[PDB]
Amino acid sequence: YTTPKKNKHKRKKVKLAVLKYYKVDENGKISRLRRECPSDECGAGVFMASHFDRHYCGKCCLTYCFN
């Protein structure tokens, strides 16, 4: 009943209705956009994140920074 903050909001997902992971050029080739994760489970599999400084894999949970 003390209520110092009146709630705690819980996360809503981003809900963006597209992937946009691929590009095609001059009648099309496959074009990966991110550095492919070298993890054994998903090698040449799922893609890594593109943050402002680093890359990040959602499955294998490993990152590559560029200092």
Partner 1 sequence: VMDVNTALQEVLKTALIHDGLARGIREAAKALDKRQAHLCVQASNCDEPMYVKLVEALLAEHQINLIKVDDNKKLGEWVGLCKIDREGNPRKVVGCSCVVVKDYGKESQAKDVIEEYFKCKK
Binding site for partner 1 (CB under 8 A): 19, 21-22, 24, 27-30, 44-46
Task: List own/partner pairs for 45-52 with CB under 8 A and 24 or more apart.
Answer: 47/21
**Strand order from edge to edge, sheet including 54-57:** 48-50, 54-57, 63-65
Instruction: Verify binding: residue 39, Zn ion, rule CB under 5 A.
Output: yes
How many other CB atoms are there within 10 angstroms of residue 15's CB atom? 5
Report the residue closest to Zn ion, judged by CB: 60
User: Nearer Cβ to partner 1, position 26 or 53?
Assistant: 26
Q: Which does 37 bind (CB under 5 to 8 A by kind): partner 1, Zn ion, none?
A: Zn ion
Q: How far is the CB of 40 from Zn ion (least distance, A)?
A: 9
